[PDB]
Scaffold this active site. Structure first.
Site, short mmCIF file in Angstrom:
data_model
loop_
_atom_site.label_atom_id
_atom_site.label_comp_id
_atom_site.label_asym_id
_atom_site.label_seq_id
_atom_site.Cartn_x
_atom_site.Cartn_y
_atom_site.Cartn_z
N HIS A 201 0.51 -1.07 0.03
CA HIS A 201 -0.64 -0.67 0.11
C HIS A 201 0.53 1.45 -0.08
CE1 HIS A 201 -4.39 -2.18 1.67
NE2 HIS A 201 -3.53 -2.93 0.47
N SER A 205 -0.63 -1.01 -6.66
CA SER A 205 0.15 -2.20 -7.16
C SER A 205 0.94 -1.84 -8.54
CB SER A 205 -1.05 -3.24 -7.59
OG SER A 205 -2.07 -3.23 -6.35
N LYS A 227 -13.57 -9.18 -9.69
CA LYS A 227 -12.32 -10.00 -10.58
C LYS A 227 -11.88 -11.41 -10.12
CE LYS A 227 -8.77 -9.70 -14.08
NZ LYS A 227 -8.95 -8.99 -14.20
N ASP A 228 -11.99 -11.14 -8.55
CA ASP A 228 -11.25 -12.08 -7.65
C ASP A 228 -12.30 -12.54 -7.25
OD1 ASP A 228 -8.86 -9.81 -6.02
OD2 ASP A 228 -8.93 -10.45 -7.88
N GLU A 271 6.77 -34.95 -0.85
CA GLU A 271 5.31 -33.78 -0.92
C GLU A 271 5.85 -33.17 -2.48
OE1 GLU A 271 7.05 -32.67 2.14
OE2 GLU A 271 5.86 -32.25 3.17
C1 HEM Z 1 1.22 -15.60 2.24
C2 HEM Z 1 1.58 -15.27 1.13
C3 HEM Z 1 1.31 -14.43 0.41
C4 HEM Z 1 -0.27 -13.84 0.21
C5 HEM Z 1 -1.14 -14.47 1.16
C6 HEM Z 1 -0.09 -12.68 -0.40
C7 HEM Z 1 -0.44 -11.80 -0.50
C8 HEM Z 1 -0.36 -10.74 -1.33
C9 HEM Z 1 -1.43 -9.75 -1.89
C10 HEM Z 1 -3.19 -10.16 -1.64
C11 HEM Z 1 -1.06 -8.77 -2.97
C12 HEM Z 1 -1.87 -8.06 -3.85
C13 HEM Z 1 -2.61 -8.31 -4.81
C14 HEM Z 1 -1.53 -9.11 -6.05
O1 HEM Z 1 -0.89 -7.80 -6.69
O2 HEM Z 1 -0.74 -9.98 -6.35
C15 HEM Z 1 0.39 -9.25 -3.29
C16 HEM Z 1 0.83 -8.23 -3.92
C17 HEM Z 1 2.86 -9.14 -3.76
N1 HEM Z 1 3.42 -10.10 -3.54
FE1 HEM Z 1 2.60 -11.31 -2.49
N2 HEM Z 1 1.73 -12.92 -0.96
C18 HEM Z 1 2.06 -14.06 -0.68
C19 HEM Z 1 3.20 -14.33 -0.53
C20 HEM Z 1 3.91 -13.10 -2.01
C21 HEM Z 1 5.66 -14.10 -2.33
C22 HEM Z 1 5.89 -15.92 -1.90
C23 HEM Z 1 6.13 -13.15 -2.53
C24 HEM Z 1 8.00 -13.17 -3.26
C25 HEM Z 1 8.51 -14.28 -3.44
C26 HEM Z 1 5.00 -11.98 -3.13
C27 HEM Z 1 5.15 -10.78 -3.73
C28 HEM Z 1 4.57 -9.89 -3.88
C29 HEM Z 1 4.46 -8.50 -4.14
C30 HEM Z 1 6.14 -8.37 -5.17
C31 HEM Z 1 3.23 -8.11 -4.27
C32 HEM Z 1 3.18 -6.27 -5.17
C33 HEM Z 1 2.29 -7.36 -6.72
C34 HEM Z 1 2.95 -6.34 -7.95
O3 HEM Z 1 3.83 -6.00 -8.02
O4 HEM Z 1 1.76 -5.60 -8.66
N3 HEM Z 1 4.15 -12.26 -1.83
N4 HEM Z 1 0.92 -10.25 -2.38
C1 LIG Z 2 12.51 -29.68 0.14
C2 LIG Z 2 13.84 -30.22 1.00
C3 LIG Z 2 13.04 -28.99 2.60
C4 LIG Z 2 12.36 -28.05 2.32
C5 LIG Z 2 12.85 -26.53 3.35
C6 LIG Z 2 13.59 -27.29 4.94
C7 LIG Z 2 13.49 -25.61 3.35
C8 LIG Z 2 15.17 -25.49 2.63
C9 LIG Z 2 13.52 -24.17 3.81
C10 LIG Z 2 11.90 -23.87 4.16
C11 LIG Z 2 11.24 -25.31 4.53
O1 LIG Z 2 10.84 -24.96 6.13
C12 LIG Z 2 11.28 -26.58 3.83
C13 LIG Z 2 11.03 -27.57 4.69
C14 LIG Z 2 14.18 -30.75 1.92
C15 LIG Z 2 14.42 -32.42 0.90
C16 LIG Z 2 13.57 -33.23 1.71
C17 LIG Z 2 12.11 -33.04 2.15
O2 LIG Z 2 11.79 -32.48 1.70
C18 LIG Z 2 11.25 -34.23 2.18
CL1 LIG Z 2 9.85 -34.01 2.58
C19 LIG Z 2 11.93 -35.84 2.60
C20 LIG Z 2 10.82 -36.92 2.85
C21 LIG Z 2 13.23 -36.31 2.47
C22 LIG Z 2 14.85 -36.93 2.65
O3 LIG Z 2 15.31 -37.55 2.85
C23 LIG Z 2 14.50 -35.02 1.82
O4 LIG Z 2 15.67 -35.06 1.07
C1 LIG Z 3 -7.58 -10.62 -0.23
C2 LIG Z 3 -8.19 -9.95 -1.70
C3 LIG Z 3 -9.98 -9.56 -1.57
C4 LIG Z 3 -11.26 -10.80 -0.73
C5 LIG Z 3 -12.00 -11.01 -0.38
C6 LIG Z 3 -11.98 -11.72 0.15
C7 LIG Z 3 -12.84 -9.37 -0.23
C8 LIG Z 3 -12.19 -8.74 0.76
C9 LIG Z 3 -14.37 -9.56 -0.21
C10 LIG Z 3 -14.97 -9.95 -1.30
C11 LIG Z 3 -14.49 -11.83 -1.84
O1 LIG Z 3 -14.18 -12.56 -1.18
C12 LIG Z 3 -12.61 -11.13 -1.98
C13 LIG Z 3 -12.08 -12.15 -2.53
C14 LIG Z 3 -7.69 -8.52 -1.85
C15 LIG Z 3 -5.97 -8.96 -2.26
C16 LIG Z 3 -5.68 -7.48 -2.73
C17 LIG Z 3 -4.96 -6.50 -2.80
O2 LIG Z 3 -4.37 -6.92 -1.02
C18 LIG Z 3 -4.12 -5.30 -3.03
CL1 LIG Z 3 -3.82 -4.43 -2.01
C19 LIG Z 3 -5.24 -5.09 -4.18
C20 LIG Z 3 -4.40 -4.14 -4.96
C21 LIG Z 3 -5.23 -6.05 -5.24
C22 LIG Z 3 -5.95 -5.85 -6.32
O3 LIG Z 3 -6.52 -6.51 -6.57
C23 LIG Z 3 -5.72 -6.94 -3.99
O4 LIG Z 3 -6.78 -7.96 -5.42
#
Ligand code: HEM
Ligand SMILES: CC(/C=C/[C@@]1(C)[C@H](C)CCC(=O)[C@@H]1C)=C\Cc1c(O)c(Cl)c(C)c(C=O)c1O
Ligand SMILES: CC(/C=C/[C@@]1(C)[C@H](C)CCC(=O)[C@@H]1C)=C\Cc1c(O)c(Cl)c(C)c(C=O)c1O
Ligand SMILES: CCCCCCCCCCCCCCCCCC(=O)OC[C@H](COP(=O)([O-])OCC(O)COP(=O)([O-])OC[C@@H](COC(=O)CCCCCCCCCCCCCCCCC)OC(=O)CCCCCCCCCCCCCCCCC)OC(=O)CCCCCCCCCCCCCCCCC
Ligand SMILES: CCCCCCCC/C=C\CCCCCCCC(=O)OC[C@H](COP(=O)(O)OCCN)OC(=O)CCCCCCC/C=C\CCCCCCCC
Ligand code: HEM
Lengths: 379, 59, 101, 295, 79
Positions: A201, A205, A227-228, A271
C-alpha cells in the site's frame, strides 16, 4: 463524518484497504493470486482447526486418529481432503504469485518482496510439519531428514538436532512439538501477510506495462472485487474436481503405512512442491554442499531485486529476458521431474545440469542479458 | 414481459431482492438435489444398496 | 558500425512498445533521476507523454493494440527525455564526487 | 451544461450547443441564414405576447396589420413534430488539473413540459434547494445539503435544476468545489436524492411548497418577465397557466406524492455525468451508479 | 490513507463512457474477441513453447534411456 466509511477507526480500514483502494486499471489475471493466496490461508486455517479437534499428537495414536477422523467424523473425510489438497493449491498459487512478480519486476518493491520471501519460507515450514502429523512413512523419514539438516552446521549442528527431536532420535516429543508448531505458524503467516500488504500500500500495485498508472487508477471495488470472486470460482473448480474425483492424485502413498523406525521406503520422495529442492540437494554429492545449495535454492530470492539491470521495469518489452525467463520455468519443471526419479543415470547428470542451469540463469544470465538489452535500445 | 415484471416487483427494492434470493435458494435446492441424485442413481443402476436392498430385507 | 545500427531497428520492432504508441522514453522505469528529469520537461512535452501513457494503459486493460498504421516507427521516435536525463545524472555525479573529496 | 446535454442526449439533436460548431460559423452562408428564417420564422410557430398598460384589442389590430403572411395549403399551417431524442446513461470527463475548481453535473431524463409531475419535481427541488459561499443563513439553512455543505466545506455552490423540453428533459444538480472535496460532496448529494425517494417528511414539503410559491411569483416581477411567461406558456404548455391554477397544483402535493414521483424518475436510473476541471477525486461511473439506490 | 486526488497531474484529456445497462457485456465475440485471442497467441507461442517443448524431449529421452539401461545386452552371455 460525513460518511461512516471514512471516519470509523475500523470500517475506515476495510474501506481504506479494499474498497477505496487505488488500483491500476490494467492489472491482468496474474494479479489474482494475491487474493487466492489470502483465501487459501483462511480456508486452510478453518479446515485445519476442524481437524485439530480430532487429532491426537502422540506416536501411538497419531495415525489412527487421522484414520478415525475420516471413517467416523461426519464429513471428516472431506475436511481431511480439502485441508491436504489446499496445501497443494496454496503452493501452486504461491508459485504463480512469485513468477508474476519476477516477470513483471514487482520485486522492485523490496519490502513487499522480502516479506513475501519470508512468507514462502514460513508456508513451506508449515506444510512440512503438517505432513508429519499423520505419522506415516513419509511423515517419519521426512521428519528425520529435515531435522537432520542442522547437523550440517559445524560444532553445534548435532546439538541443534537434540532440541528438534527432544530426544536422541525422532519420537513422540518430536511429534507433539511439531503439532504445536503447525498449529502456531499459520497465524504468524496471517500476521506477516498483513505487513506484506501494508508495505505494498505505500506504493500501490504494479501493472503489466511497468509505467506509472497514476494517470488511471480505479476503485478496487467493484472492479477487482468482482474480478477476484471470479478468479476464485475458477481456481476452485479444479481444486474441487481434483479433491472430489481424484483425491490422491497429487499425493505420495507411502503415508498410508504407519511409520517404521527401521525401514526407509525405497521410493522416498517429498510432497510434490518440494521436489525441485530435493532435486538440487541430491545433485551436490557432499553433505554441506548439498545443504548450502538447498538453502540457497530458495534464499536466492532475496538477491533478485539486486540483480536487476534493465532500464525498464517489466519483461513485456524485453524479448530476450522473456525467453530466458521461460527457459527458467522449464528449468524448474525439469528439476521437479528429476526429484521424482531415482539417483541413477541418466538422471544424476541431467540433475546436476538443471541445478547448475538454475543458479546461472539467475545469478549470471538475467543480469547480463539485461545490460545487453539496455545497449540495444541505445541507453 | 417477465424481465420488466420481475425487475419492478423483485429486483428493484433491495429488500425484496433478498427475499427472492432466499425464497429462490430454497426452491433451487429441493429441485437441484432430487435431479442430481436422480442423475447419479440412474448412472449406477443395480449397483447401489438402494437396489440390492430388497434381497435381504423383509418383503 | 552499421551493424548494431540495423540490429537496433530489429530490437525496436521486437520490443513492440510502439504497438501501444509509446516512445522508447515513455517506457523508462521511473527511478530517482528519471523522476527529476520528467519535472524538467516543458509543459506540452509532459502533457503529451502523459496522454501516450494513459492511452497505452487503456489499451492494456482492453487487451488490444493500435491498428498497424499508428505504430511508432524506429526513426520517428523522439527521445524527448534522453538529454534532460543525461544532465540530471551528470549533475549528480558531480555532487557525489565533490562530497567524498 | 453543454457537455451534459452533449452526452445525456448524445447522438441526437439536443446534444448540440446553441452557438453551434466552429466550422459552421466559419462557413455558414447568406443562403442558410435566409433559408433558416424562411423555414423556421413562420406565423403558426410564433407568438406575439405583451403585458403592461396595453389594449388587447389595439394589439391584435396592429398585429393583423403588420403581421400579415398568408396560408394557402395545409403544410403552411402545420407545426412539425420533432424526431425524439434518446437519453443515454453515460459520462464525459474533461480533465484539466490546472483549473482552480472542479464542476460536476448529474441528471436523469425529465418528463417534458406536458406532464403534471413537473410540479412535484419542482417541489422536490425546493427541498434540496441551492447554496453558495455568500449565503448568510449558513449552518442553519433548512436545506440539509446546504448545511452539510457549510459544516464540512463541501463546495463553493450547488444547485438543483429541472430543465424541461417538449418531449424530454433533464432533472439533476450542479456543484462547484475544490479538487479535494468533490467526493464527499457528490456523496452527500446523491445521498439527499435518495432521501427524497424514501424518507421525505410533511415538514420538508410544506416549506418546499412555500418556497416554490414565492419563486413562482418572483417569476412575474416586471413586464419582461410576465411577457416571457406568456410567450413560453403558449409556445410550450399550449395555453396560459394562471398563478391561481399553479398554486392549486402546488398545494395538492404532499409527502407520499414526492416520494412516489422522485422514485419514479430517480431510483435505480442510469444518470448522465459531466465533470470538468481537476476531477481526479470523483470517480468511476459504476460507483456513482450505485449511489442511485438504498438511502 | 486516501490517494484519490494526489496521484498525478493531468491536463487536456477527455473520456466518454457508457453505463453498463446501455451496452453489451461480451460484444463482438467474433469480429473482435477471437481475432485478438489469436493475435496474442501467435505473438507469444514462440517465446514460451520452445523451452517447454525442449524440456519435453529431455524428459522423454532420459526416460526411454533409463529403460534401455534396464534391458540386457546379449553380448554378455553369448560366451
Ligand atoms: C502468504 C503468502 C502471500 C500472500 C497471501 C500474498 C498476498 C498478496 C496480495 C493479496 C497481494 C496483492 C494483489 C496481488 O498483486 O497479487 C500481494 C502482492 C504482492 N506480493 Fe504477495 N503474497 C504472498 C506471498 C508472496 C511471495 C512469496 C512473494 C515474493 C516471493 C510475494 C510478492 C508480492 C509482491 C511483489 C506484491 C506486489 C505485486 C505487484 O507488483 O502488483 N508475495 N501479495
Ligand atoms: C525440500 C526439502 C526441504 C525444504 C525446507 C527445509 C527449505 C530448505 C526451507 C523452508 C522449509 O521449511 C522447507 C521444509 C528437503 C528435502 C527432503 C524432503 O522435503 C522430504 Cl519431505 C524428505 C522425506 C526427504 C528425505 O530424504 C528430503 O531429503
Ligand atoms: C484478499 C483480497 C480480497 C478479498 C475478498 C475476501 C474481499 C474482502 C471481499 C470479496 C471477496 O470474496 C474477495 C476475494 C484482495 C487482495 C488485494 C490487495 O490486498 C491489494 Cl493491496 C490489491 C491492490 C488487489 C488488486 O486486485 C488485491 O486483490
Ligand atoms: C471464462 C474465461 C474467459 C475466456 C477467454 O479466453 O476470453 C476470450 C473472450 C474475451 O476476449 P477478450 O476481451 O479480448 O479477452 C481479454 C481477457 O483475456 C478476457 O478475460 P477476463 O479478463 O475477463 O478474465 C480473466 C480470467 C480468464 O480466465 C482464463 O484465462 C481461463 O482469469 C482469471 O480470472 C484468473 C483466474 C485463474 C484461476 C486458475 C486457478 C489455478 C489452478 C491451475 C490448475 O471471451 C470469449 O470469446 C467469450 C467466451 C464466453
Ligand atoms: C518451483 C517448482 C514449481 C513447479 C513448476 C510449475 C510450472 C507450471 C507450468 C508452467 C505454467 C505457465 C503457463 C504459461 C502461460 C503462458 C503466457 O501467458 O505467457 C505469455 C504472457 C504475456 O506476457 P506480457 O508481455 O506481460 O503480455 C502483455 C503484452 N501483450 O506472460 C505471462 O503471463 C507472464 C509470466 C507469468 C508467470 C508464470 C510462471 C510460472 C511459474 C514458475 C515459478 C517461477 C519462479 C521461481 C520460484 C522458485 C521457488
Ligand atoms: C498454512 C496453512 C496450512 C497448511 C499449509 C497446512 C498443511 C497441512 C499439511 C500438508 C498437512 C498434511 C496433510 C495430509 O494428511 O497429507 C496438514 C495436516 C494437518 N493440519 Fe494443517 N495446514 C495448515 C493449517 C493448519 C492449522 C492452523 C491447523 C489447525 C488449527 C491444522 C491442523 C492440521 C492437522 C490436525 C493435521 C493433521 C491430520 C491430517 O493430516 O488431516 N493445519 N496440514
Amino acid at each position: 463524518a460525513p460518511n461512516i466509511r471514512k471516519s470509523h477507526p475500523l470500517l475506515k480500514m476495510i474501506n481504506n484497504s479494499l474498497i477505496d483502494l487505488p488500483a491500476p486499471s490494467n492489472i491482468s489475471a496474474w494479479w489474482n493470486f494475491g487474493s487466492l493466496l489470502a483465501v487459501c490461508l483462511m480456508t486452510q486455517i478453518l479446515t485445519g482447526l476442524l481437524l485439530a479437534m480430532h487429532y491426537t499428537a502422540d506416536t501411538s495414536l497419531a495415525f489412527s486418529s487421522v484414520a478415525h477422523t475420516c471413517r467416523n467424523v461426519q464429513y471428516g473425510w472431506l475436511i481431511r481432503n480439502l485441508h491436504a489438497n489446499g496445501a497443494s493449491f496454496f503452493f501452486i498459487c504461491i508459485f504463480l504469485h512469485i513468477g508474476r512478480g519476477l516477470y513483471y519486476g514487482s520485486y522492485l518493491y523490496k519490502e513487499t518482496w522480502n516479506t513475501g520471501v519470508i512468507l514462502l519460507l514460513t508456508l513451506m515450514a508449515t506444510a512440512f510439519v503438517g505432513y508429519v502429523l499423520p505419522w506415516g512413512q513419509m511423515s517419519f523419514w521426512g521428519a528425520t531428514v529435515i531435522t537432520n539438516l542442522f547437523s550440517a552446521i559445524p560444532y553445534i549442528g548435532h546439538t541443534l538436532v537434540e532440541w528438534a527431536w527432544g530426544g536422541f532420535s525422532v519420537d513422540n516429543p518430536t511429534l507433539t512439538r511439531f503439532f504445536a508448531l503447525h498449529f502456531l505458524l499459520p497465524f504468524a503467516i496471517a500476521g506477516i501477510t498483513i505487513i506484506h500488504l501494508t508495505f505494498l500500500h505505500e506504493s500501490g500495485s504494479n501493472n503489466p506495462l511497468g509505467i506509472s498508472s497514476d494517470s488511471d487508477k480505479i476503485p478496487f471495488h467493484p472492479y477487482y472485487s468482482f474480478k477476484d470472486i471470479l478468479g476464485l470460482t475458477l481456481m476452485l473448480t479444479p481444486f474441487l474436481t481434483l479433491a472430489l474425483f481424484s483425491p490422491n492424485l497429487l499425493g505420495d502413498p507411502e503415508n498410508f503405512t504407519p511409520a517404521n523406525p527401521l525401514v526407509t521406503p525405497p521410493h522416498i520422495k517429498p510432497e510434490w512442491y518440494f521436489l525441485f529442492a530435493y532435486a538440487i540437494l541430491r545433485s551436490i554429492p557432499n553433505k554441506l554442499g548439498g545443504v548450502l545449495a538447498l538453502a540457497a535454492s530458495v534464499l536466492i530470492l532475496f538477491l533478485i531485486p539486486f540483480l536487476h539491470k534493465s532500464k525498464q521495469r517489466t519483461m513485456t518489452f524485453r524479448p530476450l529476458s522473456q525467453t530466458l525467463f521461460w527457459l527458467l520455468v522449464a528449468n524448474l519443471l525439469i528439476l521437479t521431474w528429476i526429484g521424482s526419479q531415482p539417483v541413477e543415470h541418466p538422471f544424476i547428470i541431467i540433475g546436476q545440469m538443471a541445478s547448475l542451469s538454475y543458479f546461472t540463469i539467475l545469478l549470471i544470465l538475467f543480469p547480463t542479458i539485461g545490460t545487453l538489452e539496455n545497449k540495444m535500445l541505445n541507453y | 414481459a417477465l424481465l420488466r415484471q420481475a425487475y419492478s416487483a423483485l429486483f428493484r427494492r433491495t429488500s425484496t431482492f433478498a427475499l427472492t434470493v432466499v425464497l429462490g435458494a430454497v426452491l433451487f435446492e429441493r429441485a437441484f438435489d432430487q435431479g442430481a441424485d436422480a442423475i447419479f442413481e440412474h448412472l449406477n443402476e443395480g449397483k447401489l444398496w438402494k437396489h440390492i436392498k430388497h434381497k435381504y430385507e423383509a418383503s | 558500425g552499421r551493424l548494431m545500427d540495423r540490429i537496433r531497428k530489429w530490437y525496436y520492432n521486437a520490443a513492440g512498445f510502439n504497438k501501444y504508441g509509446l516512445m522508447r522514453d515513455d517506457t523508462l522505469y521511473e527511478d530517482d533521476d528519471v523522476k527529476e528529469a520528467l519535472k524538467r520537461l516543458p509543459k506540452d512535452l509532459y502533457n503529451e507523454r502523459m496522454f501516450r501513457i494513459k492511452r497505452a494503459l487503456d489499451l492494456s486493460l482492453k487487451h488490444r493494440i493500435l491498428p498497424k498504421e499508428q505504430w511508432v516507427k524506429y526513426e520517428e521516435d523522439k527521445p524527448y527525455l534522453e538529454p534532460y536525463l543525461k544532465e540530471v545524472i551528470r549533475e549528480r555525479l558531480e555532487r557525489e564526487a565533490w562530497n567524498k573529496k | 451544461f453543454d457537455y451534459l446535454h452533449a452526452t445525456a442526449f448524445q447522438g441526437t439533436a439536443l446534444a448540440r450547443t446553441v452557438e453551434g460548431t466552429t466550422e459552421n460559423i466559419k462557413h455558414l452562408t447568406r443562403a442558410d441564414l435566409a433559408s433558416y428564417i424562411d423555414t423556421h420564422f413562420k406565423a403558426p410557430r410564433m407568438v406575439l405576447a405583451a403585458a403592461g398598460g396595453i389594449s388587447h384589442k389595439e394589439l391584435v389590430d396592429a398585429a393583423r396589420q403588420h403581421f400579415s403572411g398568408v396560408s394557402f395549403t395545409y403544410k403552411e399551417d402545420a407545426v412539425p413534430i420533432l424526431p425524439r431524442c434518446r437519453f443515454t446513461g453515460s459520462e464525459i470527463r474533461a480533465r484539466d488539473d490546472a483549473l482552480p475548481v472542479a464542476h460536476v453535473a448529474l441528471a436523469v431524463e425529465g418528463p417534458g413540459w406536458a406532464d403534471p409531475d413537473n410540479v412535484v419535481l419542482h417541489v422536490a427541488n425546493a427541498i434540496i434547494g441551492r447554496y453558495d459561499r455568500t449565503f448568510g443563513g449558513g449552518k442553519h439553512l433548512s436545506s440539509r445539503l446546504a448545511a452539510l455543505a457549510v459544516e464540512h466545506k463541501l463546495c463553493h455552490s450547488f444547485q438543483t435544476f429541472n430543465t424541461s423540453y417538449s418531449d424530454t428533459g433533464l432533472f439533476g444538480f450542479h456543484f462547484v468545489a475544490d479538487p479535494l472535496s468533490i467526493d464527499d460532496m457528490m456523496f452527500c448529494a446523491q445521498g439527499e436524492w435518495m432521501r427524497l425517494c424514501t424518507s421525505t417528511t410533511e415538514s420538508e414539503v410544506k416549506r418546499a411548497k412555500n418556497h416554490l410559491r414565492s419563486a413562482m411569483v418572483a417569476q412575474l416581477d416586471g413586464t419582461t418577465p410576465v411577457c416571457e411567461t406568456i410567450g413560453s406558456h403558449l409556445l410550450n404548455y399550449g395555453r396560459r397557466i394562471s398563478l391561481e391554477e399553479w398554486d392549486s397544483r402546488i398545494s395538492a402535493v404532499d409527502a407520499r406524492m414526492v416520494r412516489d414521483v422522485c422514485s419514479k424518475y430517480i431510483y435505480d436510473k442510469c444518470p448522465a455525468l459531466a465533470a470538468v476541471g481537476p476531477i481526479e477525486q470523483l470517480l468511476d461511473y459504476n460507483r456513482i451508479r450505485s449511489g442511485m439506490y438504498w438511502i | 490513507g486516501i490517494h484519490f486526488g494526489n496521484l498525478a497531474r493531468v491536463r487536456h484529456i477527455i473520456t466518454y463512457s457508457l453505463s453498463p445497462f446501455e451496452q453489451r457485456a461480451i460484444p463482438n465475440i467474433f469480429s473482435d474477441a477471437l481475432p485478438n485471442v489469436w493475435r496474442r497467441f501467435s505473438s507469444q507461442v514462440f517465446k514460451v513453447a520452445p523451452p517447454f517443448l525442449g524440456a519435453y524431449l529431455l524428459y522423454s529421452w532420459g526416460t526411454q534411456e533409463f529403460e534401455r539401461l534396464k534391458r540386457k545386452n546379449p553380448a554378455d552371455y553369448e560366451n
